Design a protein around this ligand. Structure first.
Ligand SMILES: [Mg+2]
Ligand SMILES: [Mg+2]
Ligand SMILES: [Mg+2]
Ligand SMILES: [Mg+2]
Ligand SMILES: [Mg+2]
Ligand SMILES: [Mg+2]
Ligand SMILES: [Mg+2]
Ligand SMILES: [Mg+2]
Ligand SMILES: [Mg+2]
Ligand SMILES: [Mg+2]
Ligand SMILES: [Mg+2]
Ligand SMILES: [Mg+2]
Ligand SMILES: [Mg+2]
Ligand SMILES: [Mg+2]
Ligand SMILES: [Mg+2]
Ligand SMILES: [Mg+2]
Ligand SMILES: [Mg+2]
Ligand SMILES: [Mg+2]
Ligand SMILES: [Mg+2]
Ligand SMILES: [Mg+2]
Ligand SMILES: [Mg+2]
Ligand SMILES: [Mg+2]
Ligand SMILES: [Mg+2]
Ligand SMILES: [Mg+2]
Ligand SMILES: [Mg+2]
Ligand SMILES: [Mg+2]
Ligand SMILES: [Mg+2]
Ligand SMILES: [Mg+2]
Ligand SMILES: [Mg+2]
Ligand SMILES: [Mg+2]
Ligand SMILES: [Mg+2]
Ligand SMILES: [Mg+2]
Ligand SMILES: [Mg+2]
Ligand SMILES: [Mg+2]
Ligand SMILES: [Mg+2]
Ligand SMILES: [Mg+2]
Ligand SMILES: [Mg+2]
Ligand SMILES: [Mg+2]
Ligand SMILES: [Mg+2]
Ligand SMILES: [Mg+2]
Ligand SMILES: [Mg+2]
Ligand SMILES: [Mg+2]
Ligand SMILES: [Mg+2]
Ligand SMILES: [Mg+2]
Ligand SMILES: [Mg+2]
Ligand SMILES: [Mg+2]
Ligand SMILES: [Mg+2]
Ligand SMILES: [Mg+2]
Ligand SMILES: [Mg+2]
Ligand SMILES: [Mg+2]
Ligand SMILES: [Mg+2]
Ligand SMILES: [Mg+2]
Ligand SMILES: [Mg+2]
Ligand SMILES: [Mg+2]
Ligand SMILES: [Mg+2]
Ligand SMILES: [Mg+2]
Ligand SMILES: [Mg+2]
Ligand SMILES: [Mg+2]
Ligand SMILES: [Mg+2]
Ligand SMILES: [Mg+2]
Ligand SMILES: [Mg+2]
Ligand SMILES: [Mg+2]
Ligand SMILES: [Mg+2]
Ligand SMILES: [Mg+2]
Ligand SMILES: [Mg+2]
Ligand SMILES: [Mg+2]
Ligand SMILES: [Mg+2]
Ligand SMILES: [Mg+2]
Ligand SMILES: [Mg+2]
Ligand SMILES: [Mg+2]
Ligand SMILES: [Mg+2]
Ligand SMILES: [Mg+2]
Ligand SMILES: [Mg+2]
Ligand SMILES: [Mg+2]
Ligand SMILES: [Mg+2]
Ligand SMILES: [Mg+2]
Ligand SMILES: [Mg+2]
Ligand SMILES: [Mg+2]
Ligand SMILES: [Mg+2]
Ligand SMILES: [Mg+2]
Ligand SMILES: [Mg+2]
Ligand SMILES: [Mg+2]
Ligand SMILES: [Mg+2]
Ligand SMILES: [Mg+2]
Length: 75
RNA sequence: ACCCACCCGACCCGUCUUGAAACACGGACCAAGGAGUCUAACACGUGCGCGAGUCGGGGGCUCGCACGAAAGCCGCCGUGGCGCAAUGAAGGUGAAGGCCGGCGCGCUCGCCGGCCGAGGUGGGAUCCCGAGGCCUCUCCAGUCCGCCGAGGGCGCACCACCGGCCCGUCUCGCCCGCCGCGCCGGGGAGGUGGAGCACGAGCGCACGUGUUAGGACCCGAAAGAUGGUGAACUAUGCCUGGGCAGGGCGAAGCCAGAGGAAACUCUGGUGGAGGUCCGUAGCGGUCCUGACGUGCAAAUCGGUCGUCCGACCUGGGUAUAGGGGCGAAAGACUAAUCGAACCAUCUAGUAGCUGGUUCCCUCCGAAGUUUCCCUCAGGAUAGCUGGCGCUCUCGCACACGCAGUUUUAUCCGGUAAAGCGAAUGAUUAGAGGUCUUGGGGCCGAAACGAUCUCAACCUAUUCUCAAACUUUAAAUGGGUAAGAAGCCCGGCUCGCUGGCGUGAGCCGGGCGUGGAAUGGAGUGCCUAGUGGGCCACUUUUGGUAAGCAGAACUGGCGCUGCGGGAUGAACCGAACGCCGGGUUAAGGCGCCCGAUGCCGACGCUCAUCAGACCCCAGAAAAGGUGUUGGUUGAUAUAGACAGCAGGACGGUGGCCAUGGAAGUCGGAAUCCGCUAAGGAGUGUGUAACAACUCACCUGCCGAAUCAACUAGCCCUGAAAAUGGAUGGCGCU
RNA sequence: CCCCGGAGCCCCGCGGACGCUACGCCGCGACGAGUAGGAGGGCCGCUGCGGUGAGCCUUGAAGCCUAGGGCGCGGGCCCGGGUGGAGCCGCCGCAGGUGCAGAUCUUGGUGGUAGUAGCAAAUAUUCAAACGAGAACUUUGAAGGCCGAAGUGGAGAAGGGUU
RNA sequence: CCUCUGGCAUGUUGGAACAAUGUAGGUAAGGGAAGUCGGCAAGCCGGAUCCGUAACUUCGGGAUAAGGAUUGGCUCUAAGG
RNA sequence: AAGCAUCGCGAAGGCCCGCGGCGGGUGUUGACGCGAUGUGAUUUCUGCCCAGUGCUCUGAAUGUCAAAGUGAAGAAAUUCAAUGAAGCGCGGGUAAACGGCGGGAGUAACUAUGACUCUCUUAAGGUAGCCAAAUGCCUCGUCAUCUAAUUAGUGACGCGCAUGAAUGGAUGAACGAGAUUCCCACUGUCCCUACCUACUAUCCAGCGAAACCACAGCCAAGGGAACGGGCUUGGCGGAAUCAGCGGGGAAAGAAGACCCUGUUGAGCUUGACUCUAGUCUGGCACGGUGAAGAGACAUGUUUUUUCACUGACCCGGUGAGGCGG
RNA sequence: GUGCCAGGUGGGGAGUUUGACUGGGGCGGUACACCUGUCAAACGGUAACGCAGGUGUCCUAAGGCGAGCUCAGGGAGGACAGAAACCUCCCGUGGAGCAGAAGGGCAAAAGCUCGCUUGAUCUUGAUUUUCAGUACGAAUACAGACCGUGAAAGCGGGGCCUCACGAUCCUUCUGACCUUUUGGGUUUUAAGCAGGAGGUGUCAGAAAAGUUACCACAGGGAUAACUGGCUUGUGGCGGCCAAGCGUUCAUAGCGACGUCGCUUUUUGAUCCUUCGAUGUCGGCUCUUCCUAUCAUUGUGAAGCAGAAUUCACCAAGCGUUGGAUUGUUCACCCACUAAUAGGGAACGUGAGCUGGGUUUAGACCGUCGUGAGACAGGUUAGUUUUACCCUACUGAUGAUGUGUUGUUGCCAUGGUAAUCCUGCUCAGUACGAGAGGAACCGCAGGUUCAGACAUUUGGUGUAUGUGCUUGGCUGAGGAGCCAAUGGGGCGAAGCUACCAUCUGUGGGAUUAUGACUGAACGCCUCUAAGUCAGAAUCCCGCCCAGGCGGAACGAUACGGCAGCGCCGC
């Protein structure tokens, strides 16, 4: 009582019926697999980004003043 | 709508199957019954009520119950279920930070008073501001009905990510507090595991589907256990009764006679014994494998048979009862039942195994494949499929993304091919070189002294190869990029790295058609069936081959009708709601049979086995002056080809062959003379000869001929059994 | 520079269907195969129940037959005629023991076979009369036979129970 | 096998013809197993009287071995109380 | 089956039944008996082997050896050590128990073979007999004979795939509904068939079923699921029937018995896996009294060896009839 | 002895098991867990009991660093020493070695030799590989420590890379000032967490011997034994070439080394139909068909002088025997014959027969197995079921049209039939040295078959015709009867036998073949046009049946009612 062992006959048709997809590419991909010391220290950098907010806001205000002087000299 | 007639079509329904009209199974016909139900646990989706709550279970109070064993109500309105908090094996622990100021060295750490109060980035349906444009019967001013709104936002749900917090576990270190200053308790930073939190969503009832446990869609076993009933049949033991003609052989014992000496021996009788013989009744059943074999009969009849005084037959009573009995032993008998009787119950035992499964229409619609399983007739899991939806975009003047597609650049191969004068392996033959020895060898006592030979040597050559060889090396393919998730700037953070620097992450700002054509896309639940396949173009394995077994891409049949191939799974065309007109595909147009009933074109073909359209149903090597063409080489006026006609002599019995070659079984040889001409010869045939007889030319007829290959059609090769098939008639 | 209780118009900003069971009506475009299977609609069918039709019915209910008229693609349904004699149906909802062509299906009935196979084991019957509507089978008489005293004879037991 | 006493109507029916193939009996010239797996079936012999009876043997048998002759009727004779 | 030969048992026994008991069968019995076997009359013979599997004998000369008990540690549960019954191991016997009876080398004045000697796995290596058997693949072995012809029959040979001595060998009178071969007579078994008889079958008066049945029924070829009554192309086909007939309906008869599958059974066997009745042995209780004797610890405790009594308990007899001084 | 424990024995008895894949199943193998090269069609993936193989190990170094060298082989040299012992020089892309099978990789290495060592250590995750994107095993970068090596860069958490291995539960060990041991406290113990081990080779993992011929059940043509189907290796048969055999001479007859085809009359191969059954081998009987022709008819070629015998064609019309043995299919033998040719039809033929041997159940022997039992080993005895249905066929009534009937006939169509041998003359002739030895036409007849028939003969016989008889019965004689037809003789009629007898046919077309005339091809030629002879072939005549076929002729309803046919309309 022998039988048929293995084939791939109707399989490509079955696979292309439901539309073989590219994987779900998303913006801001995950960090699973990145090396742990560099994940550790980017976590420290994201922890200490809140330090220096007054310097960042003041320098952004001076950059707005610089763009205002530039558009005043241009217009 | 009843019957009949004609033309075309039309094999009998259900099922197992790759394939059914099947010489596969079920099936005379008709009426009635007849097969997916009910409870519980869940899961998902839907309908309703309430909502961080929900439900009244159970019970109690009202109505004596027609309607009722209904309904209404409850400091029981929550005892309790589920949810609202999870995580550890457990002791246990248990989900918030940020901004401003002050005190300690701001020491990224500890302690005090107010605020925001549940983080941030990107994509995000709706909404808000919205410059400006579009006007009116005329120019300005101008509150208003408006529409489109460039641009910017707070951003619902949801997704991706980065953060933050809770519990378990691990690493590095420090600080705080006391009723008992301890093997006390708590806290920090960073990894990692959880079914967690991150301003709830559940509860209760009802409906649909799916998975189960239950009889579980229905019918079905071979079985197992428990408790009983039978020895009227049969098996054996016991008790008490009944029965078994007539003949044959003649055991012991006994009598008499004869022969001899007793010893004894013969003869003639009598006698009636035998698990003795023929044979009746009785008992049983060898052979005809006779009769019958839907019988006289669920085991009989006829002839022929074995036995018939003892291991004989038989009635009644009685005893042995089922894993038991009993057996002159056959697993035989035990009530037509025996390799474990019968009746009832468990029991509607189980079955991956057969069969069947009951109304219509519409829409969508498969698989025989991956992996695992004592799995190969089956399940689970992915795949294929259906339903329920959600999130967005809009031919209403204004599209992000996606492909069995191509292009533009960029890489991958090691297959076809080709090569081995390149490597590895095989393998052919010459040529030149004492590389270097050796064996059969020849001249030599020997010598690399002359001749060559092969085993292994070299140098350039040459012939053929390789799925498990390869320098090369395609065609077809496989990934990528063709932008807003992209570039260009400015600045913070880092505990990584660090001569300064790098790298990564956060912010803020500026620039849009990112090659061709076509698409409206993304996503979450349940979820049946399937898990036996088969055929065909191309590639290919094993096999002599197969309508054989097994593979790769693709398409079909299965699941599919229709036109054609005469018939028909898979071939060609083409896919299907019911029709009318027209036009075709594939096939055809003498008749069957719709259409060439064209004054069709050009040739080939004669078959005493003609030939007639993929699959496909039949043919080969070889041969033919049968016939039609082509290729090559010759000769013909210096007077062809066949047709009547003169000849095969001499050196030469040349030369090995003695067993015979003056041509003669055969082989190295292989030219002159006469010359017009005979090749040291094509045959007839000889112990050898002799003889007959073929190149060349003349006398006669005077222009197309000869030879070898090769392609068409036809013929031989070519022989099977019922009468036989281009489908038939037939057709030149 | 006027209102349409009426400019009178291919549009009436004055109320605004004949067209609206909005679970309805209407207008374009594309498509239509199908087993196993899945989903939806049934104003398809059976039975019973709560409502509903001032429903039907001895001036004829259900059932059954029909060479009649029909409708729906279809499941099926509505009438016409005949039999029948006592209950029955439509709609909104609920519930189920709800649709048969098969299962060597269960029960019941009936065909072809078919007026067929068969009524053939043990030798054998024949003539006249009686009875009767009726004689091959009854009876009587006569003839010929068979069982042949281990019988086809005369009586018991087991068994049957009135034979 | 035939008859007497006793019993019966030929065994779930009869009539007409005498086809094949059957079932059960028989008979066949010549051959005698040549048929067939196989003398299967069928066929020969068979009672009694008088002779005669082998191999072998457990000395009992084999044995009715094998193989011959005779068998009727009528009329007598002899013997058997 | 008689004959033959074994095995066990002297009664608190052998074999066996029984859920059970001072239970029961043999047994109303006692080795000339009962129970379990093998072989199968008479004659003759029954060879060798105890290595294996069985069975059986004794043995503190003893490897393993459970429970109970003994000693040591601890707070104890617990652990350790010695002792350690029967049985398995060790050692004898046993084949009329199951059974087995092969190779190698040397060696005889022709060759060949081996009377003789040594060894193996494992213990001897087929003895007397017998045979191409009911037993022999080759094979239809070879020879003689029976025949015209013999794979048959009989008699011999042994090289015997794979004979063989109570898993009995050989012979053998009589007997056998046992199986084969030949001969005499005989016959339709046949050449080669023929005829007659009775009952059927045929027709008729009366009575009258059953199996089976998708629809039903004429063939050739093609294809098909690969042997068609139906499809296609041809041949063709004409009402209703009777008596036969065996070619077809892959005719009927029964869910193939053969072969396979099932994680379906049943009968049986054992060196399968778990168990169990019975049986043997050890410990505790029923279970008392005395005598001497050995061992261990140690300066009373334990293991105990046999004998004596009856008082528990068991057996036998009686009509419980004289038992002890 | 009893009651209760403990140990041995225990198929007497009980329950249960006896894997899977498989060109059917057992036996043989693992294609059952893995690894390499190929298959494999240039990403990956890809099957078979496809090919070559390998594995369940080994290593305290063969792991990890650092340093120095180059390996195999060849040439040249050197005392023993040669082809291989040891020393040196040169060439030396790896042609060696790296533990193993293979592939890849590697030259101041990944090889050899040294020096030091234990990264072959502990703890979180992530990823790859078979994959469902689950495990296990193996591997890949990292992270935190602690280390080794080196001067450092760095390298190393096993083997140069691809395999060398294993869930739940249970047990064992190790670790924490770890948790619980349920009223509280201590301790022993026990349970927990994590890591390692004890193993499931059927390798994602039951604990598992056989037999059944006494067998049973649910199924399968998913799967065999038969036949049918495809193929033809094999079996059988036929060609192509032509080195040779044949006194010379390849081809009269043969034919090596090679090669091309047919058949399903043999065995193979596959599993397409059948397991809710298709009766499984032989022999007997009987019919039809094929030719690959043994004989007969007609011919051609011979190493054909005659006889006899081989090769080849047309050709299946008619024949192909009786037996011993064996169940035989086959086989061999004896005899006859003209010759004793080969086959098919579900390996033709069991509702036709037989049952001989396969292939049930009972037995005996031999081998194997402890045993039950097995043995294409041998022997023995072993129930052969049904037609009355439809078709086909054999016979028989019939039927439709001819107005109805009868006589006489024709004919389409269908079947078909005759075959073979011996003796005499030819003729001891042709021929031949002889030995031997024909043929045509005639004459007489036989074999097989067919169709009849009973004068004779033989059989049958129940004219129950006639005698003779056994037993019984009617009183005896006579006459008879019964005894399933009493027996035995003879026997009428009728049936019947190659067991008696009679009869059995002629043409036409032509095949093969031999020819005529005569081209093509101014020659020749059976052929191309034409023409002749020509046979068991074919067809018809003879014979049998007579069509949903006709023809000619006769009579056609006087009756007690009637009714028909021709003619003019
Ligand atoms: Mg499969
Ligand atoms: Mg199936
Ligand atoms: Mg299917
Ligand atoms: Mg099939
Ligand atoms: Mg069908
Ligand atoms: Mg068929
Ligand atoms: Mg079936
Ligand atoms: Mg049927
Ligand atoms: Mg019904
Ligand atoms: Mg579910
Ligand atoms: Mg819900
Ligand atoms: Mg709960
Ligand atoms: Mg059921
Ligand atoms: Mg269910
Ligand atoms: Mg049941
Ligand atoms: Mg059981
Ligand atoms: Mg019998
Ligand atoms: Mg019989
Ligand atoms: Mg009959
Ligand atoms: Mg038996
Ligand atoms: Mg559809
Ligand atoms: Mg299965
Ligand atoms: Mg490759
Ligand atoms: Mg190539
Ligand atoms: Mg299946
Ligand atoms: Mg197949
Ligand atoms: Mg195409
Ligand atoms: Mg109900
Ligand atoms: Mg019905
Ligand atoms: Mg009748
Ligand atoms: Mg009768
Ligand atoms: Mg009486
Ligand atoms: Mg009588
Ligand atoms: Mg009678
Ligand atoms: Mg009568
Ligand atoms: Mg009677
Ligand atoms: Mg005779
Ligand atoms: Mg014979
Ligand atoms: Mg006889
Ligand atoms: Mg005798
Ligand atoms: Mg014995
Ligand atoms: Mg002995
Ligand atoms: Mg022994
Ligand atoms: Mg001997
Ligand atoms: Mg014989
Ligand atoms: Mg003999
Ligand atoms: Mg022996
Ligand atoms: Mg023996
Ligand atoms: Mg049919
Ligand atoms: Mg038939
Ligand atoms: Mg079956
Ligand atoms: Mg069955
Ligand atoms: Mg299975
Ligand atoms: Mg079971
Ligand atoms: Mg049983
Ligand atoms: Mg055991
Ligand atoms: Mg057992
Ligand atoms: Mg069992
Ligand atoms: Mg198997
Ligand atoms: Mg590829
Ligand atoms: Mg180095
Ligand atoms: Mg590290
Ligand atoms: Mg290494
Ligand atoms: Mg047997
Ligand atoms: Mg067998
Ligand atoms: Mg099959
Ligand atoms: Mg076959
Ligand atoms: Mg061949
Ligand atoms: Mg020659
Ligand atoms: Mg049948
Ligand atoms: Mg049949
Ligand atoms: Mg021929
Ligand atoms: Mg014969
Ligand atoms: Mg046959
Ligand atoms: Mg037949
Ligand atoms: Mg039969
Ligand atoms: Mg037989
Ligand atoms: Mg048998
Ligand atoms: Mg009849
Ligand atoms: Mg004719
Ligand atoms: Mg008289
Ligand atoms: Mg003629
Ligand atoms: Mg001619
Ligand atoms: Mg002529």
């Amino acid at each position: 009582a022998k039988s048929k062992n293995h084939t791939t006959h109707n399989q490509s048709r079955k696979w292309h019926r439901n539309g073989i997809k590219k994987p779900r590419s998303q913006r801001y991909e995950s960090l699973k697999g990145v090396d742990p010391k560099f994940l550790r220290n980017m976590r420290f950098a994201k922890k200490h980004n809140k330090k220096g907010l007054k310097k960042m806001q003041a320098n952004n205000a001076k950059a707005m003043a610089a763009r205002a002087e530039a558009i005043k000299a241009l217009v």
